[PDB]
Amino acid sequence: ESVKEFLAKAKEEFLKKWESPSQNTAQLDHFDRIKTLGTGSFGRVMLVKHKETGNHYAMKILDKQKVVKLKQIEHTLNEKRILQAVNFPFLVKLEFSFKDNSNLYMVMEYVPGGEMFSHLRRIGRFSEPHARFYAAQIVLTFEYLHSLDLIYRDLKPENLLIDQQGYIQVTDFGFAKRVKGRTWTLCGTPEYLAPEIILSKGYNKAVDWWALGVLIYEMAAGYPPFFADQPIQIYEKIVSGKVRFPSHFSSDLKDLLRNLLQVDLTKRFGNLKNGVNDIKNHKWFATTDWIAIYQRKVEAPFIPKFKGPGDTSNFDDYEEEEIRVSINEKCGKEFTEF
């Protein structure tokens, strides 16, 4: 019942910001641009130093013309409107946002520990207690997001950053959407798509719980439950309704994953009468103190190396691209609310 009351106040705070979003809270020359931390189809994320405070931030830069060509206008508006309104310990904080003639900018907290992706690939796989620690944070985050009628739709290790306390920060809200009914957009990452997305059905927040199953599997096995050289081959595996588990998976882990990687929506955990509690009370989580996880009181399985402020040694190197801003405003009407 206290979770219920906690979520009620969270929704009151969210809706205030959802209905009156922050806008134009900094400008580009408030920052020095240091180094690219990551890229994507839209767009790139740069380490920046805020001149007036000396704080470092991670600045996502989107080219408005590219956003238009990729038909991501509404998604980009979703991303910023949602990110500026949410507030949860495991969600990266949006500190500033603004736009200029050419680009959109979202300035987020810099999370120096690197992507979970990097650590997972290097180490091979996480122990089940390690994976469970991370998984518990995603469970709580989706409980929070779903209570706000938000679907996240892009869970993967690439989007989970490890902070200096060893806890997760979720990044990349590019496909997040506030929706009370079903929705239909084919989006996500191939390995993580639920069957109902691939099959062009209307779908709902249950796709995030499927994606959680993929994430737990990949953390504990070191590889995804459905992988191939091409996405079409991955989709055929996803919709087949068959999953194979490594022999070192515990019985409890396999049982949890069978209920998350469940094609049948009337049986998939997270989606049933008991909601998230079917997950929180599962035997695999028996050792998890959910309040202590939320409070960040649990000892983390590992603390990323910290070589100082502004150091990026936990991130890959990327080819550096200039930030060109045209003398003419592009796509002004499309992004007027950004």
């Binding site: 690939r121 590019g174 989006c187």
Partner: peptide
Amino acid sequence: TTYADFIASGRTGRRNAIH
């Protein structure tokens, strides 16, 4: 092994979202 198959595959790097 399944691990060896994954490691030899073309999708062990960062995965892009579908658009």
